[PDB]
């Protein structure tokens, strides 16, 4: 179970330092929350992370999926994808999928193809569809959806097994908090943590997840 | 989920003190592990637990499923079932199921019909069948099986969903340790904890679980 921590560009160096010392394996750069999205500014953030021994996830969340408009997102994806371990691209950004797959593949890097739903856990055929499409476009499918009950959590985790393979599963909200820890036995390879004492609904602080990972998962 | 603590007779009163101060809801009397099985020695313990305001699970495990031989077993069951909130009888002990249901039924108490496999996690149809049988005998089906991979944990949890209802799910061993926490979202109403140190692989200290429950299951 790789632990990732999302970070914007405020206090980067200190936050990155805390992330590394507390046991984070990855830093997800939420470029959509950056105060500067220029090519070299983002590139520099990528290198800093790598210099600390951690991996990166390049994310530029579109407005539709909870992010905000980034005028040069296409440039950033195409030019910095080869410099990031993982690049998270929304399944709905169909025009970039093939392009980004070719670029990352040639660079020996990985694509995370995501789907977000902040309102509910979609019906089973949607869960399977998102997984299938993510796989067909050559990436690691990612499903992050709001759980409105514990059953939604159980449903997401179990239905996802019907589309065998490496994936990333997140049931958002207080009900889905357990998914951030248990998702691993169902095939979820990466989990996300808040840097410090996490305080959006359903989140688990990095330090807590690190302790939990050694407690529950055997080496 | 209700947290239960299995206890032998050794230092009973002192351990019941810890279990109570620490947050346990139930104390599982592992009579098959008691040195004195005499009716009143056991009927006294059952009463100690209640005076401290906690619930009880009467368990006289058979050697086949990890327990021991207990002469007055039936006696203990027929005479003490109506006094314990819960009584755990093995599905394999076919003769006692019917009358034990009737007893606890008349007394307004509950029955837990268990199955153990210290070897492996049986095939899916067996997981489903044990659950069905537990239900048709009028009790809370309980399945505790050894996980030999993380996949075994996911399979146990997901397949059990196919037989909807209240139940108790346990993937034993270090691989299945997460099931003691995550089982709840799959319908597992009770989880078992070691009073203090995990003296066997997969066990989780009572204090650790009380905290984990608060963190993950506020709702």
Swiss-Prot record, chains A, B:
Coiled coil: none annotated. GO terms for biological process: 3,4-dihydroxybenzoate biosynthetic process; amino acid biosynthetic process; aromatic amino acid family biosynthetic process; chorismate biosynthetic process. Keywords: Amino-acid biosynthesis, Aromatic amino acid biosynthesis, Lyase, Schiff base. Its EC number is 4.2.1.10. It catalyses: 3-dehydroquinate = 3-dehydroshikimate + H2O. Pathway: Metabolic intermediate biosynthesis; chorismate biosynthesis; chorismate from D-erythrose 4-phosphate and phosphoenolpyruvate: step 3/7. PROSITE patterns: DEHYDROQUINASE_I. SUPFAM superfamilies: Aldolase. 3-dehydroquinate binds at residues 28-30, 61, 180, 203. One of its GO terms (molecular function) is 3-dehydroquinate dehydratase activity. InterPro entries: 3-dehydroquinate_DH_AS, Aldolase_TIM, DHquinase_I, Type-I_3-dehydroquinase. It is an enzyme of class 4 (lyase). Pfam families: DHquinase_I (PF01487). CDD domains: DHQase_I (cd00502). The active site is at residues 116, 142. Disulfide bonds: none annotated. PANTHER family: 3-DEHYDROQUINATE DEHYDRATASE. Homodimer. Involved in the third step of the chorismate pathway, which leads to the biosynthesis of aromatic amino acids. Catalyzes the cis-dehydration of 3-dehydroquinate (DHQ) and introduces the first double bond of the aromatic ring to yield 3-dehydroshikimate. Belongs to the type-I 3-dehydroquinase family. This is 3-dehydroquinate dehydratase. It comes from Aquifex aeolicus (strain VF5).
């Amino acid at each position: 179970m790789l632990i990732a921590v999302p970070l914007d560009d405020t206090n980067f160096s200190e936050n990155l330092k805390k992330a590394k010392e507390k046991g984070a394996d990855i830093v997800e750069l939420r470029v959509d929350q950056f105060s500067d999205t220029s090519l070299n500014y983002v590139k520099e953030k990528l290198e800093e992370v790598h210099s600390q021994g951690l991996k990166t996830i390049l994310t530029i969340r579109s407005p539709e999926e909870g992010g905000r408009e980034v005028k040069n997102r296409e440039e950033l994806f195409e030019e910095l994808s080869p410099l990031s371990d993982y690049t998270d691209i929304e399944l709905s950004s169909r025009g970039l999928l093939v392009k980004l797959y070719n670029i990352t593949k040639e660079a020996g890097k990985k694509l995370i193809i995501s789907y977000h739903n902040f309102e509910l856990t979609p019906p089973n055929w949607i869960i399977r569809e998102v997984l299938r499409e993510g796989y067909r476009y050559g990436g690691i499918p990612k499903i992050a959806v709001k759980a409105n009950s514990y059953e939604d959590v159980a449903r997401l985790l179990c239905i996802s097994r019907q589309v065998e393979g490496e994936k990333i599963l997140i049931s958002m909200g207080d009900y889905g908090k357990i998914s951030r820890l248990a998702g691993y036995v169902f095939g979820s390879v990466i989990t996300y943590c808040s840097l410090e004492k996490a305080f959006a609904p359903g989140q688990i602080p990095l330090e807590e997840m690190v302790e939990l990972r050694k407690k529950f998962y055997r080496l």
